[PDB]
Design a protein around this nucleic acid. Structure first.
Lengths: 144, 102, 67, 71, 135, 215, 148
RNA sequence: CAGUCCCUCCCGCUCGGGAGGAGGCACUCUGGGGGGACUGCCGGCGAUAAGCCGGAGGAAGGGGCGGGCGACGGUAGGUCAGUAUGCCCCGAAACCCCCGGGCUACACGCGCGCUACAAUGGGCGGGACAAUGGGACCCGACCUCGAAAGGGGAAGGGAAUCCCCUAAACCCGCCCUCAGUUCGGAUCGCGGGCUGCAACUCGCCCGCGUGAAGCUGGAAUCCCUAGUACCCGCGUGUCAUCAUCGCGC
């Protein structure tokens, strides 16, 4: 055991997000925080953090689930645009943190698009999401 | 043999296992191996109407409901057995759909 | 509402402890053998209430007045 | 507190209800930790009370309290 | 190992709970019990784990699959199931009496779960009426 | 984030009630609310669990659930979503008992650090005091109207105490730069000492004072 | 600090507060909440930092970015006006520019003899739908713009 | 991988965690039948009756519970503008065909709803969770271009078997530093999408700018009794389109 099943996801995502700053074939492009943000927000971030947590979070899901589109990552807890006094409805998120991320995990190969039409894990994507929990298995199995 | 799924949808409470344990009778004219009736969900249709044409004041609107209750039977048998079942299906009461695979 | 019963339940139970008074019990599980056959059926819940009154009626002969 | 302002007393019996308001229920109290060490008084209480509860009595001197009837 | 199979249901969370010999695996819906971000509903599961299974927990593997949309509904569906599962493993009925330390939901359910909405005088919700100032 | 969550899970297990507090340290010495303050809980005294059995089943509800309910109360018809939002958790909790639970827990950390006693020892002392002990009911029999002295129920004392205390805390917090955690904690301290500075003691006096006047 | 002053003027002689960079740029018209940050990245300034303590060098950067947006970038649904007066490719807006540009097009529509135009003229909504019995109690309609 | 001889995948501190097919029907579940609750039994009050309270066993109880079910008639209630129908009238017409308009005009008043007034907070990020239903010029997997509205290619599905579909509230950490604003979305400019012969008058949606009134409500008034109210989202209908509506979860 070292698999992501065993280990709270919260730490696995946090670990990956700081090692994508070391990979280092994934970075914030200029266009994305600029106005090409996932919906409209109170304050649009200029940080490296925003992006790196969003890539790190996508890489994690495809492993635990089957095929995961770009149609179910538009909202996940919120992803809504203010419609005035009419009540809020979901709307489809920024492409500059979903699709753009999955095509730079295809220059890393960590996720790949199958001829099966979907998205799937490769074993180099599970040697970079299972090397993050070899280091710790005592502060995450202290109360299993 | 050929596998048939007989899917049997019915509007009546007591016409549903009475034609899913006695359609075994209709069916069998040659040897058959048969699966006991497996209950699928009630798929529920509501349609709500106002009984009031004017609508005015306080009103009470009729919520209707038709429940169509499903049994699925599998049978493995000859062409002749399948035929018995699709030869007659009464007034309906009982909708009979047949799916054919080897 | 309240625990009151209209006399339709009372009507059928009274008739049956007229026929065979001493062949009914204070146990509820024998008064749904003999009872079941004799009494008018349209539900199980209605059957229990007439059955309840035939049971209750036997206990009342003990205490010295029977409707 | 630990002896209160109040005079703690426990309810010996709940006699009945007074008013035509219904609002007060009358309940007989005996004091043993408060003002007296054996007196029985019939006080006017409001709201839920059942035998064996503890009721804190504020009236021990005026002894205006209504006696009749439950309707 | 061995298989003992119990169910709980609270609030239309349905818990499919298997207890097997183990080593202290807690799996709920595939996932750790140490992933759970809400504080409140976590603490809920934690009551049988020092009030029905002091030492049993470390010693046994409880896997549940908890199929509802709630999270105090799932938390209490799962609780019934785990609660009952622990007491059977040890063969004591002296842990049936540790469900009398709090309001029943570790072995007894509720005969009522919902009411369907009525059309009322025309306004949403099962019991309701509109304001009345028609003049 | 995850290591903190693991530990936040550990502390109630070991055993602790609620978070890290003990139900052990009280100073309930009032016989009135002795049987209406519940000391059975050893892990959680708000789950969901509940009573609708009887009327003193209502005052057998574990003290902190009743408190959660009183904290929760005010919040109108709004719309809570990710958005950019507002305002929503009202200024007195539009959301669930689930959200209400968090504040009471936070408030408990701020007040323990201040007093150097458990928040249970402060809150329990505060309810014994904050509760009024006299009321007047209009009782007529026979036509003649008396406004005689009437004693509060023990259950009615607990509710009124909890109600005043929450209500008053909120009142200065409104449109203001407090943490609520602070506001709540500070209301509990002055109510417990019996100071007329708290909103709780104001009402405790005013209700009994009007009863003494009618009486 | 990072300056001797507590109010710097940037985007011209328009004021910058002592609170937040983001808020203060929104407050200057023709410079919106989103727009503030588009300039802020190019000039380079932190997103979370206090207003009122910038270098002299920075003041220069905000005006040149605003003047000709096109040099710096700025996508073609991000720039204040693209396709201006149906014959001009691009322009920008600032405080003084926003008054004139909207005022003109409004003036134009009146001249054209638009329904939309005459309704503005009266002081009425057009595509605001209703004017029925809203703004109840003698009150103001509301409408554009700032005075707080 | 409940439980497994078999079988394919990944990681490992190689102990051990998860899933597919053979296989298995156990479990969870589904609908059809059955049992269980009836003050049946026991004590108290009570005419020994009717009935009320308490106790025991139990998953539940003393109409268990929530709905359906509503007499003779009346308010000269409402619908001849859904259909039927007495009577009377109309016949290039009060008929018939067509294009365009209006029902949302607005200084206001009243009925019914919604949004909302910020630190009990918002943003940003991450992690745990649905249910009722509907679905072949239809839901739309997944893949690409667009912040988007939307478009292009394309799998499966006329349904416990595929799709919408991951609910939302919830919680942790940071950032913000508490103003009529980064609140709040009014109004409007410019750019664009979609339907149709066409959306100025009367459509919605997005991006950029604009950012109003409102800062907790006087007289006075309304709702609800338990899985109900307080509160959160989701689906469905009508259906090209207007939803802060209606029905339902």
């Amino acid at each position: 055991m070292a698999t992501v099943y065993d280990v709270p996801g919260d730490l696995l995502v946090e670990r990956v997000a700081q090692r994508l700053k070391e990979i280092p074939e994934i970075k914030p492009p200029e266009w994305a925080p600029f106005v090409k943000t996932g919906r409209h927000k109170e304050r649009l971030p200029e940080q490296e953090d925003w992006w790196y947590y969003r890539v790190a979070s996508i890489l994690r899901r495809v492993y635990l689930d089957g095929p995961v589109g770009i149609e179910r990552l538009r909202t996940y807890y919120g992803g809504r645009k203010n419609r005035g006094h009419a009540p809020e409805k979901f709307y489809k998120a920024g492409g500059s943190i979903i699709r753009k991320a999955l095509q730079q995990l295809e220059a890393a190969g960590f996720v790949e698009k199958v001829p099966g039409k979907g998205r799937v894990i490769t074993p180099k994507g599970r040697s970079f999401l299972d090397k993050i929990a070899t280091e710790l298995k005592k502060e995450l199995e202290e109360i299993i | 043999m050929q596998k048939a799924r007989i899917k049997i949808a019915s509007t009546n409470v007591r016409s549903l296992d009475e034609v899913a344990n006695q359609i075994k009778q209709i069916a069998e004219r040659t040897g058959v191996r048969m699966s006991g009736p497996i209950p699928l969900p009630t798929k529920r249709i509501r349609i709500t109407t106002r009984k009031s044409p004017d609508g005015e004041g306080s009103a009470t609107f009729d919520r209707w409901e038709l429940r169509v209750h499903k049994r699925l039977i599998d049978i493995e048998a000859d062409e002749r057995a399948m035929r018995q079942i699709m030869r007659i299906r009464v007034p309906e009461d009982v909708t009979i759909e047949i799916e054919l695979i080897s | 509402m309240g625990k009151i019963r209209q006399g339709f339940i009372k009507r059928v139970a009274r008739e049956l402890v007229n026929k065979y008074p001493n062949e009914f019990t204070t146990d509820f599980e024998h008064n749904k053998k003999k009872v079941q056959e004799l009494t008018n059926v349209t539900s199980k819940k209605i059957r229990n209430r007439i059955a309840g009154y035939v049971t209750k009626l036997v206990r009342m002969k003990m205490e010295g007045k029977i409707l | 507190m630990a002896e209160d302002e109040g005079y703690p007393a426990e309810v010996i019996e709940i006699i009945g209800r007074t008013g035509t308001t219904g609002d007060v229920t009358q309940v007989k109290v005996r004091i043993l930790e408060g003002r007296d060490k054996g007196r029985v008084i019939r006080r006017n209480v409001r709201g839920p009370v059942r035998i064996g509860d503890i009721l804190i009595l504020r009236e021990t001197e005026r002894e205006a309290r209504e006696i009749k009837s439950r309707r | 190992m061995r298989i003992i199979q119990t169910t709980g249901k609270r609030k239309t969370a349905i818990a499919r709970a298997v207890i097997r010999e183990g080593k202290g695996r807690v799996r709920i819906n595939g996932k750790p019990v140490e992933i759970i971000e809400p504080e409140i509903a976590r603490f809920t599961i934690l009551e049988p784990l020092i009030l029905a299974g002091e030492e049993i927990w470390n010693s046994v593997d409880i896997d549940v699959k908890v199929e509802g949309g709630g999270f105090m509904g799932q938390a209490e569906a799962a609780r019934m199931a785990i609660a009952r599962a622990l007491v059977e493993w040890t063969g004591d009925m002296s842990l049936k009496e540790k469900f009398m330390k709090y309001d029943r939901t570790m072995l007894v359910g509720d005969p009522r779960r919902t009411e369907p909405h009525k059309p009322n005088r025309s306004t949403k919700g099962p019991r309701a009426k509109r304001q009345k100032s028609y003049r | 984030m995850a290591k903190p969550l693991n530990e936040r899970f550990f502390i109630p297990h070991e055993i602790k009630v609620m978070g890290r507090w003990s139900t052990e340290d009280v100073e309930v010495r009032d016989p009135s609310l002795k049987p209406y303050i519940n000391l059975e809980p050893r892990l959680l005294p708000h789950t969901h669990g509940r009573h609708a059995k009887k009327h003193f089943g209502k005052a057998n509800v574990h003290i902190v659930e009743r408190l959660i309910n009183k904290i929760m109360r005010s919040g109108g018809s709004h719309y809570k979503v990710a958005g950019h939002f507002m305002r929503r958790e009202h200024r007195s909790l539009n959301s669930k008992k689930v959200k209400a639970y968090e504040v009471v827990k936070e408030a408990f950390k701020i007040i323990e650090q201040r007093t150097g006693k458990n928040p249970i020892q402060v809150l329990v002392w505060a309810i014994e005091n904050a509760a009024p002990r006299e009321d007047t009911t209009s009782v007529m029999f026979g036509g003649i109207r008396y406004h005689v002295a009437v004693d509060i129920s023990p259950m009615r004392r607990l509710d009124v105490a909890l109600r005043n205390i929450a209500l008053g805390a909120s009142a200065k917090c409104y449109r203001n730069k407090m943490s609520f955690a602070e506001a709540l904690a500070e209301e509990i301290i002055l109510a417990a000492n019996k100071d007329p500075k708290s909103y709780a003691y104001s009402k405790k006096l005013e209700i009994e004072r009007i009863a003494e006047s009618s009486r | 600090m990072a300056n001797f002053r507590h109010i710097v003027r940037v985007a011209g002689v328009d004021l910058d507060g002592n609170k937040q960079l983001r808020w203060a740029l929104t407050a200057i018209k023709g410079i919106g909440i989103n727009f503030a940050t588009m300039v802020c990245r190019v000039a380079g300034l932190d997103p979370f930092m206090k207003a009122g303590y910038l270098t002299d060098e920075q003041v220069k950067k905000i005006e040149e970015i605003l003047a000709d947006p096109v040099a710096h970038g700025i996508p073609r649904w991000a720039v204040n006006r693209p396709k201006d007066y149906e014959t001009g490719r691009d322009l920008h807006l600032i405080t003084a520019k926003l008054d004139m540009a909207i005022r003109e097009d409004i003036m134009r529509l009146r001249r054209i003899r638009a329904y939309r135009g005459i309704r503005h003229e009266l002081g009425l909504p057009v595509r605001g739908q209703r004017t029925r019995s809203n703004f109840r109690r003698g009150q103001t309609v509301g409408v554009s713009r700032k005075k707080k």
